[PDB]
């Protein structure tokens, strides 16, 4: 039962770094050198470096030249991830070992630690109701309605439509950065069902201990 | 540094049929290659080490061959479970590196998107904020080019996009699109178009609206 424990998603600022941790488990820790690779949305898996906690250090990737000088220790079988700078550094970074003793390929890896680099504070998201132009009801006999949720921080926020009861014909989508995550939500219906049969969209913000429960009327 | 190359960002394939993804190593890493596989938020499975070697515990389904410069993952039967990311690495030398990912997807009927534009709400213009909306929803394929225009002219300052991984129950694709100026520039225009070009139709699909204009 081979196994690596990843650290609690943290947020830095654009400024400092940030120590991970990864806590083997299941096999002699120092039989194994650890490894740890980055991964991020645009630039796909990228490996890091290598460390053997019987003493043979280590050994980095060129590009993570000094802005990611691994560290180890026994007695608790843990490995550490130092990144140094941190700006440009946001992404998930994985723990990986080896499986048998003569390929490098990875058959272990730890669960993942998201690294958010950001300069903004806890933030309530703004949500504002999404209706056809002059309410009216469309053209057809589908209507779409939306909620935008902009200048919130951290991630994430939950968004329902009616309280949970209207779940069909939902799209909700991935929250973009730009100094206050941004999402967007849009539901369908049966023209002739709205704005007789109210919708309104809820949206939950943990970090804030907010909530906003935006009707979505007729507009002009 | 070792490039690791597959050509095909997404495959599409469908449920019960044979379908193999490639990969080309920039140089000759001999047989020191491996295959994962991932699927959203979770780390990467080892699928193949050293070329064409099964791990233990995955299944028959799953086979890798190639042994110099040219590489490919084939899955004789595709099944549901199977739809994910599939990533290439070398280690024949360091520094190791990855392939950029082949994502599977179901392959479906075209599907024309609904496409939805919505002005700024009073509640956002009062805090000096407008964001114009338009959704792009079950289309297929994921293939589309979404435009903005104001007053005519495109629009590329001041967009930002979202979108869904491919539908498990329709197999079909959906975007957002918002437009994100001041109230005070929203306010000098007066026409706002959000144009989507998809293989479904000759004519881009158009949504538009003028500001104060029913």
């Known amino acids: 039962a081979v196994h690596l424990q990843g650290t609690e998603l943290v947020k830095p600022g654009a400024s400092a770094g940030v120590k991970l941790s990864c806590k083997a488990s299941?096999?002699?820790?120092?039989?194994?050198?650890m490894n740890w690779v980055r991964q991020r949305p645009e630039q796909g898996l990228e490996w890091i470096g290598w460390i053997f906690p019987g003493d043979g250090s280590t050994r980095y990737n060129e590009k993570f030249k000094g802005k990611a000088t691994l560290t180890t220790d026994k007695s608790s079988s843990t490995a550490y991830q130092l990144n140094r700078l941190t700006s440009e550094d946001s992404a998930v970074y994985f723990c990986?070992?080896?499986?048998?003793?003569?390929?490098?390929?990875?058959?272990?890896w730890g669960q993942g630690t998201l690294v958010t680099v950001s300069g903004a504070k806890t933030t309530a998201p703004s949500v504002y109701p999404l209706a056809p132009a002059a309410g009216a009801a469309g053209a057809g006999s589908s209507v779409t309605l939306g909620c935008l949720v902009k200048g919130y921080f951290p991630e994430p926020v939950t968004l329902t439509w009616n309280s949970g009861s209207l779940s069909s014909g939902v799209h909700t989508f991935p929250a973009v950065l730009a100094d206050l995550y941004t999402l967007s939500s849009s539901v369908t219906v049966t023209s002739s069902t709205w704005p007789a049969e109210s919708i309104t969209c809820n949206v939950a913000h943990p970090a804030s201990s907010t909530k906003v429960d935006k009707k979505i009327e007729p507009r002009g | 540094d070792i490039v690791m190359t597959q050509s095909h960002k997404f495959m599409s394939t469908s449920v019960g049929d044979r379908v193999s993804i490639t990969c080309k190593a920039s140089q000759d890493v001999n047989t020191a290659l491996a295959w994962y596989q991932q699927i959203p938020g979770q780390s990467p499975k080892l699928l193949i080490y050293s070329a064409s070697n099964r791990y233990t515990g995955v299944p028959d389904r799953f086979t890798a061959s190639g042994s110099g410069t040219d590489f490919t993952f084939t899955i004789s039967s595709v099944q549901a479970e199977d739809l994910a990311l599939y990533y290439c690495?070398?280690?024949?030398?360091?520094?190791?590196?990855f392939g950029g990912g082949t994502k599977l997807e179901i392959k479906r009927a075209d599907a024309a998107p609904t496409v939805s534009i919505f002005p700024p709400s009073s509640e956002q213009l009062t805090s000096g904020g407008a964001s114009v909306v338009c959704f792009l929803n079950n289309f297929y394929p994921k293939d589309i080019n979404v435009k903005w225009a104001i007053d005519g002219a495109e629009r590329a300052g001041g967009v930002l996009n979202s979108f869904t991984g491919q539908d498990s129950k329709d197999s079909t694709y959906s975007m957002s699109s918002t437009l994100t100026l001041t109230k005070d520039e929203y306010e000098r225009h007066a026409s706002y178009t959000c144009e989507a070009t998809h293989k479904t139709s000759t004519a881009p699909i158009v949504k538009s609206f003028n500001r104060g204009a029913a």
């Open positions: 990986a070992r080896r499986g048998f003793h003569g390929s490098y390929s990875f058959a272990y």
């Open positions: 299941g096999y002699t820790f120092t039989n194994y050198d």
């Open positions: 690495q070398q280690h024949y030398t360091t520094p190791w590196t």
